[PDB]
Every structure is written in C-alpha cells, then in structure tokens.
RNA sequence: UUCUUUGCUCCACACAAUAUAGAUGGAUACGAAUAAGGCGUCCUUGUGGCGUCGCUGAACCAUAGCAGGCUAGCAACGGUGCACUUGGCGGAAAGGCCUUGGGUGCUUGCUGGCGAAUUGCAAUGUCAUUUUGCGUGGGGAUAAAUCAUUUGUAUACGACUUAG
RNA sequence: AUUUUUGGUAAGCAGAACUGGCGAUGCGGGAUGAACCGAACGUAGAGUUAAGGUGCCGGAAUACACGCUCAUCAGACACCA
RNA sequence: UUGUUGAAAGGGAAGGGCAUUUGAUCAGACGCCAGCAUCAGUUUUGGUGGCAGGAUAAAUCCAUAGGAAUGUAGCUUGCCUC
C-alpha cells in the first residue's frame, strides 16, 4: 500500500472562478487507484464526478519518522452482510501505511470485510499512553518488556534429517 | 417395498462357506488359556466315535421338578485307545 | 531435602538489547540489536556497525542470540552504535562456537582444488598419529 | 487477545518439597509423597524463593490461561494433600431399609460391601483405592469417613460409593435413599 | 542419496509422511518405514476411530469378500494412506510400491541400521502445541489388530540390547575425541585449522 | 581411488506434461544436490547421457547410450528440462542419468 | 530315484548364454522428551550440581598411485584387505554382529628411481548385480507320486477317506 | 446462459425481449459433463500466457505475510449438485 | 472359418493415438553421426556502468528550540546485611 495526497478542484466554468480545491488522504497501492478512490469519496460528499472535475495534484506522502514505534488509533466503516457498522481498531506499527494494511488484513480476517466493503474514516497516531483503549496494544506498553518464543520450528531444505530435530530456543 | 410379514432369516451367517472341511481330522483352532502354576498335562485328546446308547441316572437339581428322580439321557461313546507321543513342536510369538 | 527443585526452562528473551542474527533477507547473516518489539511477531532492529538499516522486520527472518547488552528502548542509530561498541558485541560473537561453524562453512566453500588435495594429505598425516595413539 | 504472558503464584508450606522436571510434580510432606504428571497442558514452572513457585503460559489464550489456573489448583491440592490431607464424611440416608455397609477383604484387596440397600439381595462391592482409608465413625450413627492424601483418590472413592446405591425405576424424590457426601474437608483439627 | 533409506515412523503424521514417501518411491529411492505403530494423526482418538468405523461399514453388499479390505495393522494403515497417493493400478505405480517396505517395530536387518526422520512430517515440528493427536498403536488395535504387546515385548528387548550397544559406542567415542583433542597443537592440526578442517 | 566420478547423478522424474497430457520430447531431470533455478543455471547446456545394458553386443559392447543436453530450468525447486537426441522411453522414470561437466565454464 | 556307465546333488574353475524399475566412495544402529534435552565432568546417586553444544548431514568417515604398473629405502608397531583359528552373541524376517591369536598381501606417514604417448580434440568407452546349462574334478545320498485295482467315515464328475 | 420478463407453489415447467453460445466445435480448465470459464483449430520447432492451479496422485513453492476455526456430522472454489 | 509349425504378448475384455526402449527386419553404396569456433534470426537467465525525478525522497546524521514519560543519574522517606 501507499498513502497519497489527492487535491481535485472541480471544472472551472466562468461565472464560477476558483472552485474550492478539495484535498484527501487516500490509501491506495498506486496513483490510478488513489485518483479513482478520490472521486469515489467526493461523489459521496459533493455533486461532482470525474467528468465535472479534475485532479490538480497527486503526491505520495511518506512517514514523518518511519522508524518510531506508533500506536495508530484507526476509525473505520465497513459494509457487513446484514448492514453497515462504524468500528474503532488500534494497530501498533512503524508507518501509517503498514498500520493500515494490517487493519485491512485484520478486518478481512475477523469480519470477512473485503477492500470494496471498507472505508478508512481516520488513521490518527495516539500521542500520550493512558489513551490506549484496547488490551491487545496495552500488553506491549509495559515497562522493561521481555518474552520467550517456545517451540522454535527450524525448517530443512532437504527431505531427510538424521538427528531427531529439537524445538529449543 | 418391504417383506409385508417380516420373519427371521433361514441359516446362521457364521458357519460359511458351507464347503467340505479340507481335512478329515477336526482341527482344534483354540486351546485353553495356558495356566503356568499347576502341573504339566495334555489339554485336548484324539479319539474315535463308536456310537450312541441310552443311560438312566438320578438327578441332583434342587428347584427342578425331577429332583431325586430317574431320568433317561442319550449318550455317545468315543474309543480312546492310549495315544502315542512321537514329537514336540516349539512356537515363537511374532508380529505375524 | 529441602532445596525443592525446578528444572527450570532457560530461554532467549525477546527484549531491548537482544542481538539477533538475520537469516533470510538482503542482510542474511549479519548481527543487529532489537531496540523495540512491536507485537509478539514483529520487532525493530538496527545493526549500525554490521551495516543493516534500522527496519521493522518479521520474526521468521531473525534468530535470537545468547548475547545481550543494556540498550535503552527505541534508541537511535548513533546511541545503538556507541552502546554496541562499548559492550563489544562483535568480539563476543566472533568468539562463539556458532560464528566459528558459519566461518567453517564459508571457508570450506571458498576452498580451492589444490587446497582440497592439501587438506586431504594433511588429514591422513594427522590420521597416522591419532591411530598410533588409539592403538596404545 | 493471545495474552503475551500470564503466571500464577503457588505457595509452598513450611516442611514440604516440590520436585518438578519436564512436567512431573512430585510433592513430599508430613503425610507422605504425591506424584502427578501434567504433560498434557504445556506450561512452565519456575522456583523463585523455594517457598513460591511461579507457573506461567507464554502467548496464552481463553482456553490456554484457563488451564494455567487449573494447574495452580491441582498443584495446591497436592500440597494440601501432603500438608493437611483430605477427609470426606458421607451419611447413610435410609427411609425404611437400613443400609448394611462394612469393609471386607477378598484376596487382600479392601472392598466396601453394601447389603440391604432398599432390601436388595445384591452385595455391592466398592473397591477402596490405595492411599484412601475407610472409618465407620462412631459418635454419628450411619456415617463413613474416607481420608488420605490425594483429593482425586478420596473424592472418586466417595463418588463411586454414592453412585452404586442409586435407586432404579422409582421416583428418586420420594425414594431419597443412598450414601451421600455430607462434608468435604481436611484431617487436621484446630479448624 | 543412500541406496536404501530407513525411516523411524515414530512421532510422524500419517498423511504428511505418506506424501513424502510416495514422491521418493516414484522418483525411484528405495525406502523402508519401521516403528509404523507409533505413527500419529491430527485430532483426538475418537475422531479417527469414527473415521475408521465409517471406512469399515464400506463393503461390497453382494459379496463382502471382494469389497474394500479393511487392513487393521499400523504398517498396513500407512500402506493404505500411501497407496492412495500413488497410481497403484499402473506398472510405474506397482514398481514404485515395490521399492517400499513397512514394519510394526524395527525387525532384523534394520535393527542395526541408521534411522532417518522427515522434518516436514514430524508431529512435534508441525502440530500446534495444545492440539490433540492419535497414536496408530492404540487406534489399530481398537479396530482389530491383535499384536499390540507382542511388538511392545520385541521392541523392549531390541531397545535393551541397543542401549547396551550405544553405551559401548559412546564409552569408545570418549577415547576417540580425547586422542583427537591431544592431536591439536601439532604442525598438521594448525595447518588444518588454517584450511578450515 | 574408490571414486571415478566425472558426472553428477541425474534422475528422470517425468516428461513435460499437463495435469493429464504429456510431452515426451522434453524430459524432466532432477540433479543431485541442486535446490533453486539459480543453483541449476550452472548445469544449463550440459550434456546428459542415459547409459543402459542390453543383452546383444551391437558394435563392441552390450552397453548403449542415449545422448541429450540440458535446455533450461524447471519449477521453483531446481529441476531442469532435458532434450535427448532420441526421446527417453518412459520405463526409465526413476532411472539415473549422468550430467557430464561438458561445455565447461 | 539310475547302475545300460551316462542321473541327482554340494563345492571350485572355465565356458556359451541371460537379463537388469536401473551400484558408479560408505544404508554412518541409543532410547525418551520437544514449555526440552545431548555430551563431558563432579559425588549427599538424584526428577542432582558445574560446564559445554545446537540455530541442520554444507556433517562425519573414506578421500593420491596403469580404473591404480615395477622397483630402492627412512620412519612406525600402526592401519587395512584375502584365507584360517578363538571364544561368544543374536529367533521378529535371528542367515548377521562381534571377538581372539596367527599367517600372508598392500600402505599415500615420509624421501627416492624408472613406466605410461598414437584411445590422435569428446564419443558409457565397457570393470556392477542376478537367472544360468555347460564341460571339467572332488565330496555326498541312493525315493516317491499318479493312473489301474480296492474301500465308503466320502461321492453329480473330479475330489476326499481307506486297502494292497 | 447473464440481464429484463409473463403464467405457475414450483419445475431439468410453459411462453416472450436483447445479446452471446450449442446445434454444426475440436483444444486448455471446472474430476466427470452439448451450453459454464479461457480460447476457436493447416503441418512442426522454439518462446510466452489464458482460464485453472503448484502436499501426493499431478507438470508447478509441504512459498512468504497478517488473522480466524478444533467440529463424538468440521471445512474445502463460481454455473453445480 | 479352421489345422499344424514358427514367432510374440497376456492379474475382470481386446483393438486404437503421440513418444521412445527392446527384438526381428529392410531400402538409401554412396553418404551417416557428431564436437568446436565465429556469426544471423528468435528468446530465457544473470552480472555490472551512466543518468532522470519525488517534500530536488522521507529517513539516518549534525546543529538547534521545547517538552514529556513506561522518569536516567542523583535527591528524599520507609524496611536495614550499610
């Protein structure tokens, strides 16, 4: 995935000079998707479609600090089989994009919600700890954390072994 | 549709096939459980069927209608002239 | 007894300080110290001296090492490089039974055909003395 | 959630030993020796003080951390079994037919013969598990006290004795007849 | 690599091992499996019992002889699971299964031969710690196989004699490792540690 | 002294086939001790021979030889494709072939 | 199993075949656990202390010489074949494992001295494992079944059980 | 046969609209199948792909990555059972 | 359709297609089968070099301003082997 700034305006028809330039923060694997999604969302907010408007700028946005561990509190909306539901999940990751693709995977895994049936309402980094709601994140926010990895499964590149392989670590 | 009036099957389905027992001897397929304490002795014994006769005997069966009463029973006799030992086979237990 | 008794289970803890040998990747056999665990399966590792970039990596591609050193959590590449060189991680690693077995594989791979004939000769010269010793 | 790590504290009394290797809890105490292998659970024990032992589960679960507290329970039950032991009091409840219960011997095996339960001709044989001792206690009419070390030995002996005297083909709410565990407790007095 | 491979079938998943062995035999590698009565299946004893009873009930109605033969031995349960993964009706398949032998325990010649494992078909390496599994030693006997504890006697004898052998081999390898360690600090040993050997 | 080997041990796995249909012109050969297409690319263009023994002395010897060369790699797991001067007979699925170190580098 | 001698067999040779599900350095032996062990060491001998090891067998052992010739030695008191003896151990398919002394060969542990071409620039460039009858020259042993006849514990016919 | 659609509880039923198919069509795939998917075909070589897959049968990763699920009636690929 | 001889194959049919092995067989007496080098057409698989752009990458790095915690060293009160 990638995060893209998409500024589209509206078609400048004289009698209407300087249309109000609407910016988005689309999550998309390339520009051809990032611009198609831009139009999809702005067709749900304003009377304008790709014919009646124009993309004036598309610019990839990178991570401010792409090696600081961050608690991403993401607000999301998804079409279920029966209805639609607004969710709040908390990803812990190193980039906004890496956190979002983990959300898309853990939404697809836990509610069978595929790409077409998910809207990313917001992806806000949680400033101060004690604002982290979910325990599956508050686990990894404990002073002087350590934990083993029992049952270390090494993998051969050959069919036969001679040693009776161990699972120690 | 079903038999209309259901009766039990003719014949036991256990004594099959009903072919001619390959040998003419009897072929003991199971011997007793082999007690290791009590003295050594033969289990089974070969012999020859001679014929059937009648017997009369008193009947000790308390509760029976014929308690302490003569009853006729059919009996079959087997000629059992002493059987001569001529060998000994050793059998090892295997996964077959 | 009354010193009761527990085995116990000795493990390599996934902590801040744990140097980890990268097994699959562009690095593939370089050291890097863990600075911050993300979530049970994912870590943050920087090997400034070995020359692997500060990256968030999956745990299938790392092997925990017996060696550790006191690093503060989420410490940058400069702080890592100083605490690393202070503790002397590279020496404790090179003076391992495992590092030696990696150096043995890469050496016997980088052996020549003439040096293969030489080692063969020398092993049989050794073999003469050891079989004289095994007899007595 | 898959709980990163969770542990349970197991207290060890003043004159008992706990020997754990690979998952065989062998507790020794004043009463005697109790063994129990927990090779079915997949946890880790760690002696901290020779008087506390921490049992732990790494990357746990709902079904996994349930067992971690179970194994703390079973190991405390073993320490209780050697320190104080167990003692189950059962009462004979009969309406008309008095229950004739005594401990007989058959090839040196320790059985409990139950005869005249609802005037039943049958002689019910409850084999006493080894480590369990039976006492037909005086001072309480129609009582039987199953004492020893391992709770699973005492409890299953008491249960198997209750189960054999179940009234068949009746209203079990009128025919309230059989030997029922009144009390479950510890052997040592001052309690 | 070897002319004949010998696989210890203990602590192995039936189907996974069967697939590995089925490919080896078609590629033309002679294999014997031994300790076939310590094979393992995923899921509790009862599930695989019911799976078998569902297989038992499958017979040719009009003559229960010519119907699917239900072989009860752990060696023959493996053979069924492996013959499934080969085209046994074809001459290549017949020849492929001819390269295989399976035994309940480790008989002669194989009693004193080296025994390999197949890490991608080990229960310990594969099944999630917490899941319950079967043992072909218990299942096979519950469905008909009679020789559970004949094999337990013959294995217990072989393991006593092979423990004596190992205790002698190890006691010796102490002398060989000690004399090889007292061969170091020699001109030859330093030249070998330079070349890497 | 014991060893005399100047080829690698190949094995004739199968032909180039669909799920059903087979192509008997391209024969799939598994080389001993190769893992990936990268490791396999050493053996690209090499000369593979299938040495077999008949009962009739033809022109000095009872042994006959069916010649081929490695064309290219196959799959993800270091199998190669070989073309033989005359196609292989298919009864040799699992028979060993010899991968010579001819046209060298 | 024959004495018409010349037939049967076991072992050794040569020979004329006959094949090959496929040798082309070695199938290199603890068991048990895997939220645990291996090996070494210690001795209040244990579910014990202290080391160490793993993270693949990419190992280990074998590993030179006409596909391995002929010869002079120096150093060892070894390694390793071929045939023979010692005591044994193995029954799950033990048909193999040890283990004596000896002998006789070789040894690349190390210095020597000759030989190899012309298979012509590659052509598997032939060396393995069976099924063998074929003559040699030595050891060894010297029968049964079937039909026909007979019985009736059996029998459609075969078969089965008998008898001579 | 997708879509629109009438009768009919319904139908592998009856009857329409537009288009595409079978009929008259082999080939790769859905195990098998007139109609589905992919592609339409002189005789060969080489290369690359479609739909579909790559534990073993079976050519092709017992690939990598994040989760979910333990079922004494698990689940497993559209038309399609 | 049958007999004999000769040859071959044969685990609930046989026969057929593509490919080769094996056995028998037979025209081409005037050619058969290869290896290498340097080239052309096609195409697969590396290894390296020079540039372009983006937030003239974001970072890391260095300077600098402010701040906080899962609070570093010290500071302090408690149990006290200092």
From Swiss-Prot, chain A:
Keywords: Cytoplasm, Isopeptide bond, Phosphoprotein, Ribonucleoprotein, Ribosomal protein, Ubl conjugation
Protein's UniProt keywords contain Membrane: no
Record cross-link Glycyl lysine isopeptide (Lys-Gly) (interchain with G-Cter in ubiquitin), residues: 122, 128, 146
Any GO CC annotation of this UniProt entry: cytosolic large ribosomal subunit
Quaternary structure and partners: Component of the large ribosomal subunit (LSU). Mature yeast ribosomes consist of a small (40S) and a large (60S) subunit. The 40S small subunit contains 1 molecule of ribosomal RNA (18S rRNA) and 33 different proteins (encoded by 57 genes). The large 60S subunit contains 3 rRNA molecules (25S, 5.8S and 5S rRNA) and 46 different proteins (encoded by 81 genes). eL20 forms multiple interactions with RNA and proteins in the central protuberance, connecting components of core functional centers that are located far apart.
Additional remark text: Present with 54300 molecules/cell in log phase SD medium.
Function description: Component of the ribosome, a large ribonucleoprotein complex responsible for the synthesis of proteins in the cell. The small ribosomal subunit (SSU) binds messenger RNAs (mRNAs) and translates the encoded message by selecting cognate aminoacyl-transfer RNA (tRNA) molecules. The large subunit (LSU) contains the ribosomal catalytic site termed the peptidyl transferase center (PTC), which catalyzes the formation of peptide bonds, thereby polymerizing the amino acids delivered by tRNAs into a polypeptide chain.
Curated annotation (Swiss-Prot), chain C:
GO cellular component, as recorded: cytosol; cytosolic large ribosomal subunit; nucleolus
Signal peptide (from-to): none
Gene Ontology biological process: cytoplasmic translation; macroautophagy; maturation of LSU-rRNA; ribosomal large subunit assembly; ribosomal large subunit biogenesis
SUPFAM superfamilies registered for this protein in UniProt: Translation proteins SH3-like domain (SSF50104)
Annotated compartments: Cytoplasm
PTM per Swiss-Prot/TrEMBL: N-terminally acetylated by acetyltransferase NatA.
GO molecular function: RNA binding; structural constituent of ribosome
Residues with the N-acetylserine modification: 1
Annotated keywords: Acetylation, Cytoplasm, Ribonucleoprotein, Ribosomal protein
PANTHER family tied to this protein: 60S RIBOSOMAL PROTEIN L14 (PTHR11127), LARGE RIBOSOMAL SUBUNIT PROTEIN EL14 (PTHR11127:SF2)
Role: Component of the ribosome, a large ribonucleoprotein complex responsible for the synthesis of proteins in the cell. The small ribosomal subunit (SSU) binds messenger RNAs (mRNAs) and translates the encoded message by selecting cognate aminoacyl-transfer RNA (tRNA) molecules. The large subunit (LSU) contains the ribosomal catalytic site termed the peptidyl transferase center (PTC), which catalyzes the formation of peptide bonds, thereby polymerizing the amino acids delivered by tRNAs into a polypeptide chain.
Family membership noted in the UniProt record: Belongs to the eukaryotic ribosomal protein eL14 family.
Additional free-text comment from the UniProt record: Present with 45300 molecules/cell in log phase SD medium. There are 2 genes for eL14 in yeast.
Name of the protein in its database record: Large ribosomal subunit protein eL14A
Record lineage: Eukaryota, Fungi, Dikarya, Ascomycota, Saccharomycotina
From Swiss-Prot, chain E:
CDD domains, per database record: Ribosomal_L13
Post-translational modification: N-terminally acetylated by acetyltransferase NatA.
An example Gene Ontology biological process: negative regulation of translation
UniProt keywords, alphabetically: Acetylation, Cytoplasm, Isopeptide bond, Ribonucleoprotein, Ribosomal protein, Ubl conjugation
Molecular function, one GO term: structural constituent of ribosome
Role noted for this protein: Component of the ribosome, a large ribonucleoprotein complex responsible for the synthesis of proteins in the cell. The small ribosomal subunit (SSU) binds messenger RNAs (mRNAs) and translates the encoded message by selecting cognate aminoacyl-transfer RNA (tRNA) molecules. The large subunit (LSU) contains the ribosomal catalytic site termed the peptidyl transferase center (PTC), which catalyzes the formation of peptide bonds, thereby polymerizing the amino acids delivered by tRNAs into a polypeptide chain.
Note: Present with 43300 molecules/cell in log phase SD medium. There are 2 genes for uL13 in yeast.
Protein name per Swiss-Prot or TrEMBL: Large ribosomal subunit protein uL13A
Gene this chain is encoded by: RPL16A
Swiss-Prot record, chain F:
Biological process, per Gene Ontology: cytoplasmic translation; ribosomal large subunit assembly; ribosomal large subunit biogenesis; rRNA processing
Keywords (A to Z) from UniProt: Acetylation, Cytoplasm, Isopeptide bond, Ribonucleoprotein, Ribosomal protein, Ubl conjugation
Pfam family, one: Ribosomal_L35Ae
GO molecular function: structural constituent of ribosome
InterPro entries, alphabetized: Ribosomal_eL33, Ribosomal_eL33_CS, Ribosomal_eL33_sf, Transl_B-barrel_sf
Modified residues (N-acetylalanine): 1
Cross-link (Glycyl lysine isopeptide (Lys-Gly) (interchain with G-Cter in ubiquitin)): 46
GO cellular component, one term: cytosolic large ribosomal subunit
Coiled coil region boundaries: none
Cellular compartments annotated: Cytoplasm
SUPFAM superfamilies: Translation proteins
Post-translational modification: N-terminally acetylated by acetyltransferase NatA.
Subunit structure: Component of the large ribosomal subunit (LSU). Mature yeast ribosomes consist of a small (40S) and a large (60S) subunit. The 40S small subunit contains 1 molecule of ribosomal RNA (18S rRNA) and 33 different proteins (encoded by 57 genes). The large 60S subunit contains 3 rRNA molecules (25S, 5.8S and 5S rRNA) and 46 different proteins (encoded by 81 genes).
Misc note: There are 2 genes for eL33 in yeast.
PANTHER family, per the entry: 60S RIBOSOMAL PROTEIN L35A (PTHR10902)
Entry similarity comment: Belongs to the eukaryotic ribosomal protein eL33 family.
The protein's name in its UniProt record: Large ribosomal subunit protein eL33A
Gene field: RPL33A
């Amino acid at each position: 995935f990638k995060e893209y700034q998409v500024i589209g305006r509206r078609l400048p028809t004289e009698s209407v000079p300087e249309p109000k330039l609407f910016r988005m923060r689309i999550f998309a694997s390339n520009e051809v998707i990032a611009k198609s999604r831009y139009w999809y969302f702005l067709q749900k907010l304003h009377k304008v479609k790709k014919a009646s408007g124009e993309i004036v700028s598309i610019n990839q946005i990178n991570e401010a600090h792409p090696t600081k561990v961050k608690n991403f509190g993401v607000w999301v909306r998804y079409d279920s089989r029966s209805g639609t539901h607004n969710m709040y999940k908390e990803i812990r990751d190193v980039s906004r994009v890496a956190a979002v693709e983990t959300l898309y995977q853990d939404m697809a895994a836990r509610h069978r919600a595929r790409f077409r049936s998910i809207h990313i309402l917001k992806v806000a980094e949680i400033e101060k700890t004690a604002d982290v709601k979910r325990q599956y994140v508050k686990q990894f926010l404990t002073k002087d954390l350590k934990f083993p990895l029992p049952h270390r499964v090494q993998k051969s590149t050959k069919t036969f072994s001679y040693k009776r392989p161990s699972t120690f670590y | 549709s079903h038999r209309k009036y259901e009766a039990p099957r003719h014949g036991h389905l256990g004594f099959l096939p009903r072919k001619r027992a390959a040998s003419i001897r009897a072929r003991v397929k199971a011997f007793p459980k082999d007690d290791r304490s009590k003295p050594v002795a033969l289990t089974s014994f070969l012999g020859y069927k001679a014929g059937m006769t009648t017997i009369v005997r008193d009947l000790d069966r308390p509760g029976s209608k014929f308690h302490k009463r003569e009853v006729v029973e059919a009996v079959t006799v087997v000629d059992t002239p002493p059987v001569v030992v001529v060998g000994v086979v050793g059998y090892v237990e295997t996964p077959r | 007894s009354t010193d009761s008794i527990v085995k116990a289970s000795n493990w390599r803890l996934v902590e801040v300080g744990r140097v980890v040998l990268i097994k699959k990747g562009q690095s593939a056999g370089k050291l890097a110290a863990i600075v911050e665990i993300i979530d049970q399966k994912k870590v943050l590792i920087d090997g400034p001296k070995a020359g692997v970039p500060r990256q968030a990596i999956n745990l299938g591609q790392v092997v925990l090492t017996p060696l550790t050193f006191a690093l503060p959590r989420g410490a940058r590449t400069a702080t890592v490089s100083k605490k690393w060189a202070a503790a002397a991680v590279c020496e404790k690693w090179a003076a391992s039974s495992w590092a030696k077995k990696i150096a043995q594989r890469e050496r016997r791979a980088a052996l020549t055909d003439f040096e293969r004939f030489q080692v063969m000769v020398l092993r049989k010269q050794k073999r003469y003395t050891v079989k004289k010793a095994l007899a007595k | 959630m898959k709980y990163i790590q969770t542990e349970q504290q197991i207290e060890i009394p003043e004159g008992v030993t706990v020997s754990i290797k690979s998952r065989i809890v062998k507790v020794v105490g004043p009463r005697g020796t109790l063994t129990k292998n927990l090779k079915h659970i997949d946890v880790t024990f760690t002696k901290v003080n020779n008087q506390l032992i921490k049992v732990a589960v790494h990357n746990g679960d709902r079904k996994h951390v349930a067992a971690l507290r179970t194994v703390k329970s079973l190991v405390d039950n073993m320490i209780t079994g050697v320190t104080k032991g167990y003692k189950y009091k059962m009462r004979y409840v009969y309406a008309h037919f008095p229950i004739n219960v005594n401990i007989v011997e058959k090839d040196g095996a320790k059985f409990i013969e139950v005869r005249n339960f609802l005037g039943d001709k049958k002689i019910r044989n409850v084999p006493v598990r080894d480590g369990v001792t039976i006492e037909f206690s005086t001072n309480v009419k129609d009582e039987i006290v199953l004492s020893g070390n391992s709770v699973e030995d005492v409890s299953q002996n008491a249960a198997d004795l209750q189960q054999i005297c179940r009234v068949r083909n009746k209203d079990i709410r009128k025919f309230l007849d059989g030997i029922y565990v009144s009390h479950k407790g510890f052997i040592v007095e001052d309690e | 690599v070897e002319p004949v491979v010998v696989i210890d079938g203990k602590g192995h998943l039936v189907g996974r091992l069967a697939s590995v062995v089925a490919k080896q035999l078609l590629n033309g590698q002679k294999i014997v499996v031994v300790r076939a009565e310590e094979l393992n299946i995923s899921g509790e004893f009862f599930r695989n019992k019911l799976k078998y009873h569902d297989f038992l009930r499958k017979a040719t109605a009009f003559n229960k002889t010519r119907g699917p033969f239900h072989f009860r031995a752990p060696s023959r349960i493996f053979y069924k699971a492996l013959r499934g993964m080969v085209s046994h009706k074809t001459a290549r398949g017949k020849a492929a299964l001819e390269r295989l032998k399976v035994f309940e325990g480790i008989p002669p010649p194989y009693d004193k031969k080296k025994r390999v494992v197949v890490p991608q078909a080990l229960r310990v390496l594969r099944l999630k710690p917490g899941r319950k599994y079967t043992t072909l030693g218990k299942l096979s006997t519950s469905v008909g196989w009679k020789y559970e504890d004949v094999v337990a006697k013959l294995e217990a004898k072989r393991k006593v004699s092979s423990a004596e052998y190992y205790a002698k081999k190890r006691a010796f390898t102490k002398k060989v490792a000690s004399a090889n360690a007292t061969a170091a600090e020699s001109d030859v040993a330093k030249q070998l540690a330079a070349l890497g050997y | 002294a014991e060893s005399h080997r100047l080829y690698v041990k190949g094995k004739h796995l199968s032909y180039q086939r669909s799920k059903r249909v087979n192509n008997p012109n391209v024969s799939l050969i598994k080389i001993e001790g190769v893992a990936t297409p990268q490791d396999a690319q050493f053996y690209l263009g090499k000369r593979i021979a299938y040495v077999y023994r008949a009962s009739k002395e033809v022109r000095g010897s009872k042994i006959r030889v069916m010649w081929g060369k490695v064309t290219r790699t196959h799959g993800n797991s270091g199998v190669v494709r070989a073309t033989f001067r005359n196609n292989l007979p298919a009864k040799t699925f699992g028979a060993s072939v010899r991968i010579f170190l001819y046209p060298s580098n």
